[PDB]
Structure formats: structure tokens, C-alpha cells
Amino acid sequence: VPDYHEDIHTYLREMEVKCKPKVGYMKKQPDITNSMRAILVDWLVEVGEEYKLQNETLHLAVNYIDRFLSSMSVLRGKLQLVGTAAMLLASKFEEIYPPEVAEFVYITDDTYTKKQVLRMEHLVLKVLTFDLAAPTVNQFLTQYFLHQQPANCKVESLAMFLGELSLIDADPYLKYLPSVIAGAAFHLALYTVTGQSWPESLIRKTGYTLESLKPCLMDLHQTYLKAPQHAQQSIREKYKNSKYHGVSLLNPPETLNL
């Protein structure tokens, strides 16, 4: 029960409006598309698994890519480099020891030179004006998780998974704030594991009613369901591992109950 939880939560809430990527930015990228994006992100999921990075690192990396593509046009040839740069930055900012630039080059099958990688680090830092402390869905879930009773390892692991699913498709998710998607994710998982729902502490803490959460629950339920279909499958193979209780295996509910 810190003296800060509330100011922090408020602050994070303020901060996230500042850090919001442009909602319709993929429709003005003349050479890349949401699906190329989906490919890019699914790769970072794995690159994260291979070097055993934290899950926050991945949320940081996607936020940077989205803000950067939100004001720079990028060719489909240079997009991976942008993703590598962003995973590098997020690494440096969130990890206790990042992998070295060398390793980041390796994982692209020596496809760019480590100088290209370093110079795109620099270009990303400029475009984002060294603003790297962005709130994320994972940040808000961790906050929200303090208000559960009893704590459930399985709701947590599942909530995280759903939040990572939203990372992959820019439509529809770029429309919602991370605070809101964490909302949806928290409830959907909690519902899924237990039949319970978005608690009142959260409703009073956040000011989100289950009602306002609705439109985003619709989409997160749809993703959850089409989950094994999806052209990309790294987040599922990730959350099959039992460090996570195998949640990705558990059965989506067919109906929300609202």
C-alpha cells in the first residue's frame, strides 16, 4: 500500500495520452502494412524468448516502433532494422544486461551491418526525442494485479498472454489506450479462469466501468478465439511453456456475458 500507487497510477494515466501513436498511421505508410507489422512483432516475441528478455522489454519495443512509424515512412526492406533498433533500445532501458549489438545483428541472419544497426538506434532516439519511459499494457496489468482476491497465478499468466496478443494486430488495437486494453485483458482472463469479473476497486480506482470496457472486450475475445488460427504463433508457443502454466491451451469462453 505505497503513498504513491495512486499518484503513479494517475501519472501513468496522464503519461499515456502523451505517448499515444497516431491511430491511422499504417494507412499512410506507402510501402508497409499491418500484416508486415504482425510479422515483425511475432519475430520480436521469439527474439525475446531466445535471449530471455523480460516481457516489458517487448512492450517497450512495440511502442517505439509504433511511434516511429507514426511519423517516418519506412520501406519494407528497412522495417526489420527499425525493429532491431527498437528491441535494442528497449533492451538498454529495461534490461539489467542487454545482449550486445553483435547478437542483435546475428538474429537477423547477418542481414544488416552492426553499423546500420547502431545508426538506426540513433535515428530512433531522435525521432522519439529520447522519450522512452512509455506506459504499456504490461505496466497497467501489474498495477491492476495488486487489487485481486485471492491472487491467481493462472489469471495473471493468461492476462499477460492476452495483452501480448494485442501487440500483434495494429487494427483494432491502436484505437485503445494501454490502460483500457489491460482492463479488457484483466477481465477476460479473470472471467476465463474463474467466471468472476472486473472488480469494483478497479472500477473506482480507474473510473472504467465494465460497460466502457466493452468495445475492447469484443475485440480481445475475437482474437482469443481465432488465436490458434492466426498466421503468427510465437506468443502461443511462448505461453505453452509451463513457466506460464500452459494457459494458451486453456479454453476460451464462447461467450462473454457482456
Binding site: W43, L79, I107, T111
Partner: peptide
Amino acid sequence: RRLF
């Protein structure tokens, strides 16, 4: 791996 290389990637689009």
C-alpha cells in the same frame, strides 16, 4: 532470421 531475415523476413516480408
